[PDB]
């Protein structure tokens, strides 16, 4: 199921055209709202007095059709950045006219070209139009992977084409887009319509568009090959790009005339459909989180807040996660109770943060398969979940499990535990204050007691994503710091982004913490070798944890626990994007700060340039103790 559109520059009649387009299998049509060659004068007589009508009548389509089927196209003669003043004036007036007519029709999107380096005036006119009434209409900037000048035939004898590699030069079109949208102050209504050429550029040029708001891919019919049967197809390299683009769920646009005249025109579209049908999405985890892609979420604070019923449900819908706990407990019971003591040695297990009881059951299943005896405590401070635990305890668990409705830091245990099990970790590992909770519960762990998890570590990686930068930016609220949205982390299924360096460890914690001088504050410096030209918008966070020995949990991509759904990555944004060149190093600083009330993070970028310190004194974000 591919959403595709047909691009035309010639429409003798809208009704007939739209019908032929729909019958061929297209979802929408890109067409001009004024005739492409109908140049119009606005200042000098007598041409400015040309009698109307200036274009077609809106009555030729229903309101619903204009809203859903038509994509307007700026007339190609409109050149706001022409070096001739007269042409700039006329183009400005014509641009507003055509744009306003598009808004008049309620068109869902409008196509404007980025076919040169200087589009300053073009951006000004567009920006002016955007700030003339609040509308949801989109603007698709048509920009090619490879500038036409950089793909022209080498047929000019006295002006040969370049044959030496110009790394940055081959990325020029991205700079066209970057400057245009920066001039437009990152307007959420301005997206990319990436046009694919017959010959693809280097991978770095293509990767440049990672994280950009690509809404459409344009495929000219002239890039398609021809198989034995005579149908249009694509090279394996182009197929590789189409597959990457399907992961972004862009809308594909077919432009150009039919060059495979032996076959009908839906042939090009059929190939897209065919390619769409031929791909593989990892079981569940890509099923699972397809709806949560780039969706910002507030990180849980299960300590300061009491989690809702369906939030625990989400925790429990991950069997791989808890079977890892079961195995971790299993291995530990055998290591602590020799075979000859399997009937006399009863181990005291304590779930610290039992929720609705998935760890409790995992502990029971662990003792069975290990053929050992355990005495269970189910500690949980969220009283609403203690309702679930105690109904479980009366109906099933029985006297073997003791539910304790208390905070693990204040609970006065009647005895000491052989094994404490906890699931107090967040996307950034310690961002829910698992160190502080386990520290306060440490007194009722035996001198040889084991803590599961035994240790965890958080990882950071610089990412580029103008899309996510805009979503964070859009999170301004009425009665707080206008920039507070940049000084707090978000749990998000990072999708449309580009990871600029390999993740590196940030903060690590061990339990039990035998050290006499426990200090959970942290200060870490990281240097990320970046081998590409990009723009830094934030840092992605992951975590790894050791439940016991070799049994582990991880959302770090290179060591991701296969099949585990729980825990999306966390995102630490930065107020201002930072340009980074190839070979430069990104130096980031992170602090874990705390007082008696709150714990929080502070971060700053020191290379290649200095950012402001983010979330100083937890002014914008703190974690409740």
């Amino acid at each position: 199921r591919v959403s595709s559109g047909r691009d035309l520059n010639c429409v003798p009649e809208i009704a007939d055209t739209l019908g032929a387009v729909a019958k061929q299998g297209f979802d929408f049509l890109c067409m001009p709202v004024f005739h492409p060659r109908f140049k119009r004068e606005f200042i000098q007589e007598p041409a400015k007095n040309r009698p109307g009508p200036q274009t077609r009548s809106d009555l030729l389509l229903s309101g619903r059709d204009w809203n859903t089927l038509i994509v307007g196209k700026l007339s190609p003669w409109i050149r706001p950045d022409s070096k001739v003043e007269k042409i700039r004036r006329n183009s400005e007036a014509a641009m507003l006219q055509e744009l306003n007519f598009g808004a008049y029709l309620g068109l869902p999107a409008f196509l404007l070209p980025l076919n040169q380096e200087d589009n300053t005036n073009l951006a000004r006119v567009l920006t002016n139009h955007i700030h003339t009434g609040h509308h949801s209409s989109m603007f698709w900037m048509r920009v090619p992977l490879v500038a036409p000048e950089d793909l022209r035939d080498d047929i000019i004898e006295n002006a040969p084409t370049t044959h030496t590699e110009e790394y940055s030069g081959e990325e020029k079109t991205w700079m066209w887009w970057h400057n245009f949208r920066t001039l437009c102050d990152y307007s959420k209504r301005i997206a990319v319509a990436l046009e694919i050429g017959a010959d693809l550029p280097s991978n770095h040029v293509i990767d440049r568009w990672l994280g950009e708001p690509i809404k459409a891919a344009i495929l000219p019919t002239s890039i398609f090959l021809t198989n034995k049967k005579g149908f249009p197809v694509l090279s394996k390299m182009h197929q590789r790009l189409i597959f990457r683009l399907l992961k972004l769920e862009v809308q594909f646009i077919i432009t150009g005339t039919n060059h495979h005249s032996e076959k009908e025109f839906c042939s090009y579209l059929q190939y897209l459909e065919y390619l769409s049908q031929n791909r593989p999405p990892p079981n569940a985890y890509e099923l699972f989180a397809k709806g949560y892609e780039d969706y910002l979420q507030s990180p849980l604070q299960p300590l300061m807040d009491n989690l809702e019923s369906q939030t625990y449900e989400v925790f429990e819908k991950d069997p791989i996660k808890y079977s890892q706990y079961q195995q971790a407990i299993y291995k530990c019971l055998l290591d602590r109770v020799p075979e000859e003591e399997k009937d006399t040695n009863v181990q005291v297990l304590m779930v610290l943060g039992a929720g609705r009881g998935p760890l409790v059951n995992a502990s029971l299943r662990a003792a069975k398969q290990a053929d050992r005896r355990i005495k269970l405590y189910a500690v949980e401070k969220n009283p609403n979940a203690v309702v679930t635990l105690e109904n479980w305890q009366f109906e099933e668990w029985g006297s073997q499990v003791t539910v304790v409705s208390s905070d693990m830091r204040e609970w006065v245990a009647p005895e000491k535990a052989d094994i404490i099990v906890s699931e107090l970790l967040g996307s950034f590992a310690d961002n829910e204050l698992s160190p502080e909770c386990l520290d306060g519960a440490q007194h009722f762990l035996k001198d040889d007691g084991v803590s599961i998890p035994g240790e965890y570590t958080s990882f950071l990686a610089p990412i580029s994503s103008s899309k996510l930068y805009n979503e964070v930016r859009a999170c301004r609220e009425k009665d707080r710091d206008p920039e507070a949205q940049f000084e707090m982390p978000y749990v998000v299924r990072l999708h449309n982004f580009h990871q600029l360096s390999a993740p590196q460890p940030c903060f690590t914690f061990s339990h039990p913490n035998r050290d006499p001088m426990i200090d959970n504050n942290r200060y870490c410096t990281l240097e990320f070798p970046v081998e590409v030209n990009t723009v830094l918008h934030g840092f992605a966070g992951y975590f790894e944890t050791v439940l016991y020995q070799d049994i582990t949990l991880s959302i770090r991509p290179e060591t991701h626990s296969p099949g585990m759904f729980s825990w999306f990555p966390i995102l630490f944004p930065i107020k201002q994007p930072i340009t980074v060149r190839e070979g430069q190093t990104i130096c980031v600083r992170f602090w874990r700060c705390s007082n008696s009330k709150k714990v929080w993070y502070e971060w700053a970028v020191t290379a290649p340039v200095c950012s402001a310190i983010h979330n100083p004194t937890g002014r914008s974000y703190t974690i409740g103790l």
Partner: protein
């Protein structure tokens, strides 16, 4: 009101070309309104145009007529908005205009077309940035060149060299072509060029106008600020010492001499001036058409 001839002719007139005997060929486009199409007309009586009821022949085209040109005495080569190059031919009776072939080879609007010396091949320019060499007999594209980096504004075949022709584009290139060379294009040394015209009596000499209203005489430099807007076209007169007619988007027609000096000025048009054609019978009569639907017959003082 000949047969299979539309009752109404489109408003925007784009092409006007005389032939040997003196019949006038008209190309019209509908650049606004419900239907955006075009048409072709033949006026054996040039004074009866653009009246449709007193024309020799006529026919409707599927899309607009961006540019056209004669192919001999009965052939018409059309640059269509649909991205196709069309060849129409009059019947033996010259009362019907029939479509000979319509090939969709360009991926965008075909804006310019020109017939080469031999009269058996033609070169076309399009907004898809391509330039194609056509075999009118085999109805196929012999060569497709992507030498420019922007729209191809104008392509003009050499008068007597069948392998040479000019082209200009919005990439600010003026390319002299010689398909006899391995690399057939050559960049000839401002504002964007918009029109081309070879000299009929001098091999290596041509003129070209720019988007700023300047006309320039170039040997393979003399120039003059002729117009206040884009120079749409340049047509040399058939005289032994020819005159130069320049039309522009400023709604004016100019007639220049050997040194680009102005000898005549017409403002009869109220809209853009799209073409100009000299009468083969009366050398001092110059016909122009424009988007004001006017067919003006100028008497140029010589």
């Amino acid at each position: 009101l000949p047969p299979n001839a539309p009752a109404c002719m489109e408003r925007q007139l784009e092409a006007a070309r005389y032939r040997s005997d003196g019949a006038l060929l008209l190309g019209a486009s509908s650049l606004s309104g419900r239907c955006w199409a075009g048409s072709l007309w033949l006026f054996k009586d040039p004074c009866a145009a653009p009246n449709e009821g007193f024309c020799s022949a006529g026919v409707q085209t599927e899309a607009g007529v961006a540019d056209l040109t004669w192919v001999g005495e009965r052939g018409i080569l059309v640059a269509s908005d649909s991205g196709a190059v069309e060849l129409w031919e009059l019947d033996e009776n010259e009362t019907l205009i029939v479509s000979k072939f319509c090939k969709y080879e360009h991926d965008d609007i075909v804006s310019t077309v020109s017939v080469l010396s031999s009269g058996t091949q033609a070169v076309s320019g399009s907004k898809d940035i391509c330039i194609k060499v056509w075999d009118l007999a085999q109805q196929v594209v012999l060569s497709s060149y992507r030498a420019h980096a922007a729209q191809v504004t104008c392509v003009a075949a050499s008068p007597h060299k069948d392998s040479v022709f000019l082209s200009c584009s919005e990439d600010n290139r003026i390319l002299l072509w010689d398909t006899r060379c391995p690399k057939p294009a050559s960049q000839i040394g401002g504002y964007l060029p918009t029109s081309l015209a070879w000299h009929p009596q001098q091999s290596e000499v041509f003129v070209f106008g720019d988007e700023n209203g300047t006309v320039s005489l170039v040997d393979t430099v003399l120039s003059s600020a002729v117009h206040s807007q884009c120079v749409t076209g340049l047509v040399f007169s058939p005289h032994s010492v020819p005159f130069l007619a320049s039309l522009s988007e400023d709604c004016s027609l100019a007639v220049l001499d050997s040194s680009l000096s102005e000898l005549f000025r017409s403002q009869a048009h109220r809209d853009f001036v799209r073409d100009a054609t000299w009468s083969p019978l009366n050398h001092s009569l110059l016909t122009t058409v424009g988007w004001d639907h006017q067919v003006v017959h100028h008497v140029v003082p010589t």
